[PDB]
């Protein structure tokens, strides 16, 4: 251990460190442009015009700091040997779609926190193809515009028409009625509303909410996805339009259904979290279901109404299942996803049990929903009225000994070929261990139910027998289904375009396969990069927003082209470019990807940022950045500069930065992710230590006496796990936002991975870092706790209880608060402080 061959980081003053962090972000405004996404291809059908399509998307042109609706013009033929990069024309007339200083309503701020929307303005919009309707949320109001429906394709921008309201409060979750483009719907004060663009007439549809006081006293909401669904099950809406319109044939009235989820979150614990306006010194109530404690009591419901040909909501009607939801579907804790089949015949839904090891798809035909009234004899009356044939058909039932990941891919096909036998495309990770597509043909044969009396379901009650379940993909790789990935199914060519990890887990590639013959899968994206793709509805061209470890993200428009007789082998030729790779930050050295094997012989991947201007011989101090928990993959072939600029800053000061994807990470299958079940915290840190020890042996510049562990959310929890079970390895531990007590965390995440505490008490206690504070160092300058004070996800309680137990065990700590930051540090000033605090802490104490 020669002390002259151990790299000393240059001790900068605090203002120096600020100068360095600021100097990082001089060129980082140009690196991240919040590039084109949310794409909608529209044809022009002219046969004499210049542009073949119009691409609609969200994007940040150079004049504004804000995300807005734009379009590009995709031509009929490009020239050879010329790179054509499209101009981003503005749809809207350069107005301000964000309130003052980036503030929002409480529902908007919460929804942006669940969606991780760091960018301001028009973040989510809705589009209806034929009428060409753009319904969006701008400022604190709703807006719309249209582009080439019965109208035409504009060239200068048109200002967006404002939709006024009589309702007091913000309007969440706007969706255009597919069946009637004049109609749309939104959430207002935890109730489903419906409106009409042409007449301006609004109309409430559910009446479970009253706006009395805080959520402790008025607990029923409707069409809203609650916290645990939003945060864990990645659903941000709880109402689904029917895509087709039924006609009752009374006089002329056109019915229009909506499936929505009623939730009675009365029996769920309320927690108070500090509000953003610190001066007011008030809190917000939050219906936060702890592990063990009760989740909201859910139910599916039909909100129908009918309309005159002039387009006025004459009638309305709440409808409910003939028996309760809890009784028709016992052991159904969460509605993961729901929607409708395209023809409108059945409303589908993915159910889940409280362990989250039992998922099942169910079809709910609208005649299964009778109306609702308080008089139980009218209820029996329409219970007699419901057709004995009609029932729910459990089409698919995934069961597993590990856990269900919610895969949103369900693509039921048209059923007019012999009108039973539902055919769908279901992603199934539980079968082989890897998320793979299947074509599944179930058999909907009605058993005949006396729906007036109440019966109890059996364990295989409504479960349909399967005709066949052909596997369209198989292997040691997965189909991307979570995180808003999706499949695009051309039913004319019978092909399904999906994204996957087939070449490598480090690169998301667009693949295509046939659902009729499960032949060779064909890759459409270039290898050596990772791609986020989006197909045209006519499937003749797609966009891919792609990147690599070295190159930043670009957004290229490729065009599937070839003989129509063989659609699988249509060659994607580069047509045009949307966004190009922005030139790197100065002094930015990309990380090196590596892999290695664990002593149990499982392949783990990792990154390293080398210390800039390396002198071999010198053993540099090493910051092991980490997350390690599920649903995330840090190490992959894709540009890190955006989210991990600090890792490069560390490298530029001379820190080795190592990042390891331990066991339990996403996109390496279920058995891999499954390693951390009921022993969370125990295997991940062992994989990170082994990754350090491998990189230490492989590369010669890691001083093991100087190792820092650092990460946020799950990363701070592991950083604390590192400092507990490996103090001899980890010199310091900068724990940001840590989960110190699993018993305090929500059901959706923890129960999936750690089980109910009553069952896995050994592993709840073993992996709650707050409970093992006695094993933290008695010496100081080894532990820095960071926490955003308004964190409504990993509540401040976690850091507070940690500091409590550190005090009680007589252990030092440093601590940093971010009073205006929730979970991700969003404010640039606060992020600059966070990073200068990180550099100082490492400078002095590593």
């Amino acid at each position: 251990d020669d002390p002259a061959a151990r790299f000393q980081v240059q001790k900068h003053s605090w203002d120096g460190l600020r100068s360095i962090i600021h100097g990082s972000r001089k060129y980082s405004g140009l690196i991240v442009n919040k590039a084109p996404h949310d794409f909608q291809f529209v044809q022009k059908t002219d046969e004499s015009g210049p542009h073949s399509h119009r691409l609609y998307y969200l994007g940040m042109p150079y004049g504004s700091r804000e995300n807005s609706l734009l379009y590009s013009e995709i031509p009929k033929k490009v020239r050879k040997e010329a790179l054509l990069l499209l101009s981003w024309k503005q749809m809207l007339d350069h107005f301000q779609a964000t309130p003052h200083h980036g503030v929002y309503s409480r529902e908007e701020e919460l929804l942006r926190e669940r969606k991780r929307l760091g960018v301001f303005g028009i973040t989510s919009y809705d589009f209806h193809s034929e009428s060409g309707l753009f319904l969006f949320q701008a400022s604190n109001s709703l807006f719309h515009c249209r582009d080439g429906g019965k109208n035409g394709f504009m060239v200068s921008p048109m200002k967006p028409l404002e939709i006024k309201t009589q309702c007091s409060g913000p309007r969440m979750d706007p969706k255009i009625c597919p069946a009637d483009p004049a109609f749309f719907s939104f959430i207002n004060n935890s109730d489903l509303w419906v409106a009409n663009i042409e007449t301006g007439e609004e109309r409430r549809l559910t009446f479970c909410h009253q706006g009395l006081s805080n959520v402790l006293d008025d607990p029923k909401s409707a069409g809203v996805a609650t916290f645990v669904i939003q945060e864990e099950f990645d659903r941000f809406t709880g109402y689904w339009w029917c895509p087709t319109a039924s006609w009752e044939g009374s006089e002329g009235l056109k019915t229009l259904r909506i499936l929505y989820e009623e939730v009675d979150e009365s029996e769920v614990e309320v927690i108070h979290v500090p509000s953003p306006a610190l001066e007011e010194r008030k809190t917000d109530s939050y219906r936060y279901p702890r592990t063990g404690s009760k989740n909201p009591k859910i139910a599916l419901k039909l909100a129908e109404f009918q309309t005159d040909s002039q387009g006025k909501i004459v009638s309305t009607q709440e409808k409910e299942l003939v028996q309760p939801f809890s009784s028709l579907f016992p052991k159904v804790e969460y509605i993961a996803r729901a929607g409708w089949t395209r023809d409108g015949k059945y409303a589908w839904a993915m159910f889940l049990d409280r362990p989250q090891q039992w998922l099942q798809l169910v079809l709910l035909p609208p005649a299964l929903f009778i109306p609702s009234t308080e008089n139980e004899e009218q209820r029996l009356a329409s219970a007699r009225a419901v057709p004995r044939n009609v029932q729910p058909y459990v089409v698919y039932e995934e069961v597993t000994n590990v856990w269900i990941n919610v895969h949103d891919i369900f693509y039921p096909f048209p059923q007019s070929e012999g009108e039973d036998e539902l055919c769908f495309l279901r992603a199934n990770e539980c079968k082989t261990g890897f998320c793979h597509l299947y074509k599944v043909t179930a058999v909907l044969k009605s058993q005949g139910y006396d729906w007036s009396e109440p019966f109890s379901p059996g364990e295989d009650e409504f479960k349909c027998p399967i005709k066949e379940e052909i596997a369209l993909t198989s292997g040691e790789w997965e189909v991307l289904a979570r995180h808003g990935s999706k499949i695009w199914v051309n039913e004319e060519t019978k092909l399904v375009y999906f994204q996957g990890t087939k070449d490598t887990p480090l690169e998301h590639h667009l693949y295509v396969v046939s659902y009729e013959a499960a032949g060779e899968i064909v890759r459409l994206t270039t290898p050596g990069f990772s791609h986020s793709c989006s197909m045209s509805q006519n499937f003749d061209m797609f966009v891919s927003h792609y990147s690599s470890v070295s190159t930043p993200p670009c957004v290229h428009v490729y065009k599937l082209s070839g003989p129509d007789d063989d659609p699988l082998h249509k060659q994607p030729r580069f047509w045009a470019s949307m966004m190009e790779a922005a030139s790197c930050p100065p002094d930015y050295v990309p990380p090196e990807i590596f892999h290695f094997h664990t002593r149990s012989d499982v392949r783990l991947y990792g990154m390293i940022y080398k210390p800039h201007a390396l002198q071999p011989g010198k053993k540099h101090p090493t910051v092991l950045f980490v997350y390690g928990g599920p649903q995330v993959q840090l190490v992959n072939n894709s540009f890190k500069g955006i989210k991990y600029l600090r890792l490069n800053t560390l490298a530029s000061l001379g820190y080795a930065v190592v990042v390891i994807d331990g066991r339990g990470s996403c996109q390496r299958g279920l058995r891999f992710e499954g390693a951390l079940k009921n022993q969370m915290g125990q295997v991940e840190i062992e994989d990170q230590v082994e990754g350090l020890q491998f990189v230490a042996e492989k590369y010669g510049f890691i001083d093991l006496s100087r190792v820092a562990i650092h990460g946020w959310s799950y990363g701070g929890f592991l950083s604390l796990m590192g400092l507990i079970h490996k103090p001899q390895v980890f010199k310091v531990a900068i724990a940001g936002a840590p989960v110190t007590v699993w018993m305090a965390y929500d059901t959706g995440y923890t129960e999936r991975y750690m089980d109910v505490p009553e069952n896995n008490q050994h592993g709840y206690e073993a992996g709650s870092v707050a409970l093992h504070v006695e094993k933290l160092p008695n010496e100081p300058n080894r532990l820095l706790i960071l926490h955003g004070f308004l964190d409504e996800n990993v509540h401040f309680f976690h850091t507070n209880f940690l500091v409590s137990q550190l005090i009680r065990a007589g252990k030092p700590y440093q601590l940093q608060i971010y009073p205006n930051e929730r979970h991700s540090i969003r404010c640039p000033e606060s992020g600059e402080h966070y990073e200068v605090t990180l550099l100082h802490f490492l400078q002095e104490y590593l």
Binding site: N33, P50, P61, E73, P75, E81, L84, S87, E580, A582
Partner: protein
């Protein structure tokens, strides 16, 4: 241009919109000495030039930092196909190092957006193209 016929002074139709026109009576041409732009053709025809400004056009394209402006962005309206070479005033880098000639890419704007055609060859202060100069 100040070619074989001596100075054919450009008439100015509007100072504020920076439009110019010439009629040049003989074959070839010599570089106009304000920056050195030169277009050569065989025969006496009218042509007008506009000195377009990037700021509306590079507002459309977002890594406008990723391309450095080398010159004036001149538009030409002559009849198509009768122009045979256009010379655009490239700022000199071949005297220095680390700047490649296979690298260079030419900005041909349209209503479609930016077309990055390859220039034919680069001089010390000039890029030359072929006949289809639009």
């Amino acid at each position: 241009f100040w070619g074989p016929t001596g100075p054919v002074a450009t008439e100015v139709v509007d100072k504020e919109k920076n439009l110019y026109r010439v009629h040049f009576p003989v074959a070839g041409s010599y570089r106009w000495p304000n920056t050195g732009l030169c277009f050569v053709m065989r025969e006496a025809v009218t042509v007008e030039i506009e000195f377009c400004v990037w700021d509306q056009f590079l507002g459309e394209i977002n890594p406008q930092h990723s391309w450095m402006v080398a010159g004036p962005l001149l538009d030409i309206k002559a009849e198509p196909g009768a122009v045979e070479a256009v010379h655009l005033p490239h700022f000199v880098a071949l005297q220095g190092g680390h700047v490649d000639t296979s690298l260079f890419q030419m900005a041909h704007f349209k209503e479609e957006g930016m077309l990055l055609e390859k220039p034919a060859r680069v001089e010390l202060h000039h890029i030359v193209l072929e006949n289809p100069s639009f």
